[model samples]
Target: GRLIYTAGGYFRQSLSYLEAYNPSDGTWLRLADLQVPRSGLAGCVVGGLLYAVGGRNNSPDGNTDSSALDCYNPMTNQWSPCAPMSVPRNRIGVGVIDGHIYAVGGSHGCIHHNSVERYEPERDEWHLVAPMLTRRIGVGVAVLNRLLYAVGGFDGTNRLNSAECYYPERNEWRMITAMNTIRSGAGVCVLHNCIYAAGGYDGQDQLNSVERYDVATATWTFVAPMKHRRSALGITVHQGRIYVLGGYDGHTFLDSVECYDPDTDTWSEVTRMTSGRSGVGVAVT
Candidate 1:
């Protein structure tokens, strides 16, 4: 875990950066802020381009109505625009597989959605994909071996553990084993062919437990726990290590960052972000 680029923490309109190392050497270095100030947007990196799309914007009232699709190119350190998604979803989560990007379930207001959309970057257009099996919000998306995985989220009733994968080529979905402990807002990523889910809320409290879903066998298993319990956190695999950034705990938002090593099943603290922010706009490109 060398570096992380983040937007919308305690600082307003200022994207933040964290270096590798404990106590998280950080500088609130400026990057292009969102064209419209918003957090909880879906994000992913494809071919060194970072796309941040659809989130609640302006108004402290936190309105979910949105039409923003912002693209950031890391090499040039610039921000541009992309074709807007057909659906308006803040708290959206995106997964990139093959040459396509999938925008999965998210909320419109208090209501959760199950609609999924696929974006063709080359053509700059969107093709609606099969809707998710479960209606969810604040989702975590991971792409491993060409299959797009969706795990743990609120269904407008309760936090869920149910998981599913989309076969991109087939353009269809098949159910997978549900998580041992279902929760929403979990940090998700793929490493060494295994999909990892960590840090979120079940229903009552925020969680620190870490678990992995094996794509080959379609199973969920335990891993090391995080030092702090949080939900709506951001996670990325940079270099070789997994870096988990900030989130909320039902009380105060956290500025803390932590890292996990699959090799040793170990957890260690990294540098803290400049301000406490849950549900940030993040990219590792």
Candidate 2:
């Protein structure tokens, strides 16, 4: 397995950079840049191609949000364009199942934020799918036991503690147990049959709290908290551990990284990123 990281910026800037992290050596190798610099973008791996979805471009002092699709090939180390999504989005939830990519809840700065889109790489096309019951931004999504789970996020007015799952077969979303604390911009990933939701903002303050959902019991249990309170963090599972990357804590951008161990129910700090960032895109192959 390989760990990959992509674009995000500080407060007002965005990046087009890509880097590969080698856990074995605890070092990162700089890869190519995206055609465009972005933030709040969602990254996914499908059929060996790494795809970067909709995000807000923040460059040239006159940036615009995008619905662009760009894919990177590790074999060739080249990037190519794909069919753009129907709506411009950032802070989106993405998952892959049965060879298709599910782009979940996100806002184009406002409404139409609950829309769901599905992409069939084999067909090079994207189409609308079942939308989430609530319009959420900065939500975390994870697929467990063939179901897609949407975790805590902001609903425009208040930070949300709610969670839900989408069943592709039924084309429906079912509400689940709400998280213990309201939050948005947390990192979510599935490991050992449970959905783990890590640090994010609790509406009033940044949070270092962590929680996990047991699909069998339909409940969320507290897990070990992270070392730093973070939002807009990058997350992915590698070798049974959940790795969390750089994020903002309302004071300064972070270059620190940490990982969660399910077996011991704890977190340990890892090597820091070269530069601090927020709203990063991360993946594994």
Candidate 3:
């Protein structure tokens, strides 16, 4: 059952389409489309349900960003609406802890945001939570030792290398060590208590460099980089390896993908997708 979910996204335009990856056969299976088409939405699996939250409904000519929350149940193969977010946003960062989903910073139209919201599945509610220390978009989020970590992102005028962690019990977000390079749209994953940061764009260039943050020492170390300089890619940890898929390299949209094995500190090319795609939502359910 090695399957990965690619939710709504923009290819040539915003799409309501949803697809699932079958590593078993190296194929993609289209699923039910979203009630509302969107891009820049972030997704996570909680209680066996896939939830997509807050993104732009369309491209440049689009009307407005969304506060919409959509949920899909694989068991019944249906897509349903859920409680909307408090604020409309796109390019959000999402992470789940203890059963609750946390939607981190994105942007309210062109304005960047530091706001964070939490969703309780049992109550089907979304409540505003403690915001991040700085406003950012395309931040990378991962759960390490049950705490949520927010990594590098663009802060309106600049790309950032800053990092922070949040504790739910304390309702607090504390700044932590920064990454070795500035990366907005990077892929993040946790493996054995260590967080891996992969391909993204710095302020000037698309990057293929990778870094690993050691939680115990509060330090970052370089690791094998991906073969391509990818931005806005989809990242997921499967079978102890990290996969980076579909992103723009400042020139062309990418159909190729690569995976990293921490055990050997290496990255290897994976089966390519049928077509090039960027900003697609990726998750493991």
Candidate 4:
């Protein structure tokens, strides 16, 4: 059975908390904590290892940005340090292709970024890649048909609906059709040969709306909205369904979970997580 692991999140008290959810049993198990407590980090599984990338650490004194990288070994049930990124990245987008992890644009303080980097696990190093045309923060990223897609995010000035794709072979990025709605901190994933960008903040309000991008048609269309408004959520696909976990709903951080079935074109609420977790990083292993 596949298990979904959730890494560091915005809950200050439990900033380094790590847990795994068993969809089959509808249960969650507490795992080891991150070496460095972080929020807005990017998580992905590569070569059977769970990688937690750059994020920010908010302390009572002040906010501190981190470029630390940590890797989890399931077999050993432990987390170890890895080579850190060259710069701190908060709310970054991450995707894995050909066994390498790609870290896309994010922000530091008020500075949104257009820079991109790729990690080679064997060398345990990150290398610069072609930058995006626009600076972005809280971007949603996913890999589809061998191309890395970066969706809606904030550009320091406004919530963005613009989208773009990267070609690894050519080391280039090209703008694609924009999403139907402005989104920042949207949960994005690939399903049924299409890309789904779910609930996020639209500048004024937290959203429940969802959109689907068809690679073949190069267009985006509306899909069924989620049951509740959310932003900065963690999302992953499991057993043909899309599972979205904890996020913020304007007033409070949420612990609720929702599942989307592409076959039915519907979303249903699922078991809640142990605690509220906005800006959480989720990956399936």
Candidate 5:
């Protein structure tokens, strides 16, 4: 789908940055250490600035409730500190719409929450927004047709398929069609007008159930299943195809990668990653 900028979600949680090429290729490129190491965090790109939001520092007693903010400038390949978020969280869902970036629901101390906040780069500050109707721990947000849609996630106890649309113009949230399969910790990518959800845990087990949502109808439909079931994978839209990157395969981390072509309603194998890892978030500059 897209290239990875950091190495994490592995066993030691060290901060390793590298440019990973598709299928068995990557240069071990290390940048500055995060003031702290973390996984299951959130990020969003606005006006070319990447903001790495709140993430954990490896233990229940660690960076939870931490407001650390790490800002990365892809243009310069450097990291800097930014104004912190109001609430500290992990496994957050972030999205940008209309010049505002949103930091949503997150987990801490095994508890999940549904509060939401927004950041305006121009202002270099944060402000609270409408909280999600329900607490969602690992949802995915995408801006489609000017509205921000936040989708499926787990709420500590169970997996969710619910979706909500936040209309900035109205400053309100409206319930939308739920996903075909309830999942969490998956990768969501927007291609043109559609949102594709690739891999994740499906309540009882990890899944390969690939689904897509049509913004016009507020409906979800199943597409081709992936080559393998996974969770916490990275997904992106590249050249009109949905590429699903490395993710957890229930028992161990996986290095497998695959792509699905919505035009053919089929999936095909691609190059595997350099290492097995999950909880990855990716982007293409």
Candidate 6:
């Protein structure tokens, strides 16, 4: 059986909360807390371990960026610290390829970053990779066909619609066609060889619109919109469907969860999370 895990987020301005959802029984189970409380963190599963990457912590004194990398073991139900990133990153994009985890663009403070890094588990080290063409925060990343795709985000000056993909074989990144709408915090995943980008903020408002990118044709086409506008949501493909967890809906933090079926191109409501969350990290194990 497979389980979907959602980690630290900003429902209470940085939570150590960690929970797992079982698809078979449609149930949720509370898991161990993160070593550090963070928001806007990035999560990915590699070699059967769940990794919670860089994010930020909000304290009464001030806000601080985090470069901590933590790994979770399901069997032990505990989280352990791993080699941290070179720089602190919040709202980062992450993916895994060839057993290595890639941490993409995000911001440390007012500065947005284009720098990319990859972690080698055996060595427990992070090495620099090719930076993206544009500096971005709140970017969405997905791995498909052994290529890592970095999608829409905010570039400080404007919300971005552009995207790019990194080829590990060449150690380079190439620009891809832009999406139809500028999305700063979209939920992105690959399904049926197509990249699906869901609800996010479009500078002016939270969005419910969704789009699909076909790599073969190098084109983006509108897909059925989600039921509610969301930004900074947690998304992952599970049991052949895309599940999007709680996010901000402009007015308040959301606990609502929705899933999308590519075969029907429709979205439907699912179980709500125990607590509202945004800027959450999600992965599967």
Candidate-wise lDDT, in order: 0.77, 0.84, 0.85, 0.91, 0.72, 0.92
lDDT of 3 by residue, 23-81 (tens): 66778888898888887887789878888888777766755688888889998889888
- Clashing residue pairs for model 6: none
The segments of candidate 3 whose C-alpha lies over 4 angstroms from its true place after superposition are none
Residue pairs of candidate 1 with colliding backbone atoms: 23-271, 24-271, 161-182
lDDT of prediction 6 = 0.92
Better of 4 and 5 by TM-score: 4
Tens-digit lDDT string for candidate 6 (1-285): 989899999975798989999877889999999987899998999888999999999766778898889999999998999999999999999999888999998998888999999999999999999999889899999898899999999999999999999999999989999999999999999988999999999999999999999988999999899998999999999989999998999888988889898889889997888999899999999
Off by over 4 Å in 4: 12-14
Question: What's the TM-score of each model vs. the native?
Answer: 0.90, 0.96, 0.96, 0.98, 0.88, 0.98
What does candidate 5's lDDT look like per residue over 135-181, in tens digits? 88777777788877778898888898888888887878888888888
- What is the Cα-based TM-score of model 6? 0.98
Ranking by lDDT: 6, 4, 3, 2, 1, 5
Task: Report RMSD (Å) for each prediction in the order shown.
Answer: 2.9, 1.3, 1.3, 1.0, 2.9, 0.9
Candidate 2 per-residue C-alpha lDDT over 174-247 given as tens digits, one digit per residue, 9 for 90 to 100: 99999998879999899999998888899888889999999889889998899999999889998989999888
Candidate 2 matches the true fold with a TM-score of: 0.96
Model 1 is weakest, by summed lDDT over 10 consecutive residues, at 14-23
Point out where model 5 deviates above 4 Å: 1-7, 12-33, 59-66
The residue ranges of model 2 lying beyond 4 angstroms of the native Cα positions read: 9-11
Indicate the residue-level lDDT of 225 in model 2. Answer: 93
- How many residue pairs collide in each prediction? 3, 0, 0, 0, 0, 0
lDDT, candidate 2, at 209: 93
